[PDB]
Structures are given as structure tokens and as C-alpha cells.
Design a binder for this molecule. Structure first.
Ligand SMILES: [Mg+2]
Ligand SMILES: [Mg+2]
Ligand SMILES: [Mg+2]
Ligand SMILES: [Mg+2]
Ligand SMILES: [Mg+2]
Ligand SMILES: [Mg+2]
Ligand SMILES: [Mg+2]
Ligand SMILES: [Mg+2]
Ligand SMILES: [Mg+2]
Ligand SMILES: [Mg+2]
Lengths: 228, 228
């Protein structure tokens, strides 16, 4: 079944049997199912399960789902959870939590596809095969220079419409939409509304690409604002 | 400049000079710029410009932007506008307007990519090149049988991760999310929120694929509901 559907069925159970049924979920989509559950039950689960299981779930969550989870935790549980993260996930999680709580960066993930201006389209397709299964989305490719700075945002389909011998520099327009880490979540919503893109890149004040935010999470932000 | 940015600059002008500046827009993205302008000015423009210009703009708009425009028009202007549409666009526009005004189908577009279970991945890529520039999005591929019925929704990146000799039938799971034309716009929003997909397909009660709805238009629906 679809992870969102599995999560809905679990959410209908009383909490006590909900934990047993969740632990029956196969491990490949256990983290994805977990990401759809209520924050109070997510906290109960993190407090209750064994350390190895905590690490499996937390290390497999997306960085932005993990940040959203940690925002609702007491500080002590945040530290416990971070102590269960592997080195790379731990560094990512602490970087994201370092941003101001109102910043758009709190919603971002660093798992995006990076391409280079000197690459052929064929080389881009090879990179896409390399990282495609681990990234948040394959549908946007971020052209970055040697200084980590964002220079273009190329749609996946545009790459497919070009010939494989073409260089990325021949299909770039050097125009793109990006949101800075200074921008609040509320203000970032209007970028998404205006530009009608399913992901937007998040850059530092000097133009360095640090993550992407996706439209599904923006919809949650809109509903949170409108209830609050 | 970006069409949304051009539209914003135009929207800042007083209406009188706004029409002249808009008619200066190059024709390739004139319709896209038009789609971002206020409905009252869109109506003034349709009433004012020549028949050839009316046809160029209206025939180049997306079917769902056109339906949204027509929903705010007096009936007489709807008829005038439809009389300016080319045969294919006219049949599409009348089909969309035939649905109940509260139906999710009012938000849909028929410009999606259709693939077949018997095709190789290579053949799918050839189809994607064929239609890619005209469709609403290249990022979702709709597997349909000989009876026009929807059987799967394949992400573009998934197609890229497979080898070109593989048949579509070897990468389908026969599980998908679809919304029926019976469903209201309000109820359709929750499908988008739950399943976190940037497009969803719209099917008839017998399972025939008739269009797709995209998340950017759903965001507009959420804001319209929340103001209303
Ligand atoms: Mg996310
Ligand atoms: Mg997610
Ligand atoms: Mg969330
Ligand atoms: Mg660009
Ligand atoms: Mg919009
Ligand atoms: Mg649309
Ligand atoms: Mg549009
Ligand atoms: Mg609209
Ligand atoms: Mg499927
Ligand atoms: Mg959601």
C-alpha cells in the first residue's frame, strides 16, 4: 500500500496498538510512514523504541521532516535524537536547527541534484542516475559554480529535450528564482504562489546554494498559518 | 524577464497604459504573461483588442487558465471568446465548461503525457520528446490502456532510472492516486495535501483519464477558499 495510506490506517488505531502495528511496517518505507503520523505519537515512539530502531527511523527521515519533528520536541529529546543520528545526518540536522525558527531554511532539505556548467547533458543524466534514488526530487537540477554558488535551475524535462552532446552552458539562461535564508516562512509562500514551481532553491546572502523547499511542505505552511 | 515578473510590472501600471505595454509583450510568452493578470483587466483586454489578437491569446492560453477566465465573464463574452477559439481549443473549452462549476474538473487540463504498457522505456522517451513542449508538465507519465482507462502514474525520474529496453509493464505497480470528476474542488485539495504529488490525474466514474490538476492551481484554490 501507499505510505500515506498506511499512515492513515495506523492513525485510526488507538495509540497503544498503533505502536505495535507501526513496528510491523517493513523497514524500507517505515520512515516514510512515520513522517505522516501525528507529532505526539511520533514523540511517544521515539521515547519508547530501542536505540537501534530510533537510529534506523531518524537516520532514514528526510532532513526537513526531522527538523519539523524536532521543533515540537523538548530540548532533552532533541539531544537524545541527535545522539542517535549518524555523522552526516547529525551535521545536517544541527545546521538546519541553527537557522532562526521563522526562517524558510527550517523547511529546506540539502538532498538536491547538483550539476556543473562544463558538463554535457549525458554527464548530467549519469549524475541523475547516480543520486536519483536519494534526492528529494529529480525534477529540478541546480547548476552551481566551483564556489558552490547557484547560477541556474534547469527542469529535468528540459534536459531531456536537448541532445546529449550539448553542454549545460548551452541550455542555461542564467535567470532563476531563489529565496534567501533571511526570508521568513510566511514571505517565502508568496514566491511559491507567484512562480508556480514545485521546488525552489534556498541560498545564502552570498548566493551559495544550501537547500531546496518543496511545494508539499509549503501547503502545510499555508494551512498552519491559516489555523494559527 | 520571467513571465510572472513581466506580469507583476504590468499590473503596477494604471490600466490605460497597461494595455499598450502588454501589447508590446513578445508573442511567444504573451499568453503566459496574460494568465498572471487580474481578471478585470483580462476581460477589458478581450473586449478591446482585435479578433486576430483575441484568437492568438485565447488559443495560446492553457485550457484551465481559460476556464478560470471564462468563469468570471458574462455569458455573451464567453460566447464571443469561444467563437474566437480554434476547433481543438473550442472543443476542449466547451467540455471543461460542461462540468459542474464546483467540480475538480474545472481546474484540469487535458495536456498530459500518455504512455502505453507495451512500450519500451526508449519509446516513452521518444513520446516525451514528441509532446514535451506542449504539455502542462513532463514530470508525470500516465499509463493508459486501449480503452483510455488510467492504469498507472509513472514519475519521469523513475523512467530515467530504468534501462531503455525495459517495457513499461515491468516498471508499473498498478497502484495510483486519482480524483473523480464527481469530487468537489474543496475535497480534491485534501488529496493533494495527503499524497504530496505536484500533479494528480482526473478520471471519470468508469476510470477514463480526462485531465490533470497541478499543485500551483490547488494553492490558488486554498487561498480562494480561505478568503471566501
Ligand atoms: Mg519535504
Ligand atoms: Mg516528505
Ligand atoms: Mg511537515
Ligand atoms: Mg533559468
Ligand atoms: Mg500561482
Ligand atoms: Mg494550470
Ligand atoms: Mg499556469
Ligand atoms: Mg487560476
Ligand atoms: Mg503507481
Ligand atoms: Mg502533505
Amino acid at each position: 500500500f501507499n505510505p500515506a495510506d498506511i499512515a492513515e490506517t495506523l492513525s485510526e488505531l488507538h495509540a497503544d496498538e498503533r505502536l505495535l502495528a507501526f513496528l510491523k511496517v517493513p523497514k524500507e518505507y517505515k520512515a516514510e510512514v512515520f513522517s505522516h503520523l501525528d507529532p505526539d505519537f511520533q514523540e511517544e515512539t521515539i521515547r519508547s523504541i530501542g536505540s537501534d530502531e530510533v537510529s534506523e527511523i531518524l537516520n532514514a527521515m528526510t532532513p526537513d521532516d526531522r527538523t519539523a519533528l524536532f521543533e515540537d520536541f523538548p530540548d532533552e529529546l532533541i539531544k537524545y535524537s541527535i545522539n542517535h543520528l549518524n555523522p552526516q545526518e547529525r551535521r545536517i540536522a544541527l545546521k538546519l536547527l541553527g537557522y532562526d525558527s521563522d526562517s524558510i531554511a527550517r523547511l529546506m532539505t540539502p538532498y538536491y541534484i547538483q550539476i556543473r556548467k562544463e558538463w554535457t547533458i549525458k554527464r548530467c543524466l549519469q549524475q541523475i542516475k547516480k543520486v536519483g534514488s536519494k534526492v528529494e526530487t529529480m525534477n529540478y537540477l541546480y547548476v552551481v559554480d566551483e564556489r558552490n554558488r547557484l547560477i541556474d535551475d534547469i527542469a529535468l524535462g528540459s534536459l531531456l529535450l536537448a541532445e546529449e552532446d550539448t553542454l549545460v552552458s548551452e541550455i542555461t539562461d542564467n535567470h532563476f528564482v531563489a529565496i534567501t535564508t533571511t526570508t521568513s516562512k510566511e514571505d517565502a509562500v508568496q514566491y511559491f504562489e507567484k512562480y508556480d514551481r514545485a521546488a525552489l532553491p534556498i541560498v545564502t546572502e552570498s548566493g551559495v546554494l544550501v537547500g531546496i523547499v518543496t511545494i508539499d511542505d509549503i501547503l502545510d505552511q499555508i494551512e498552519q498559518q491559516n489555523t494559527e
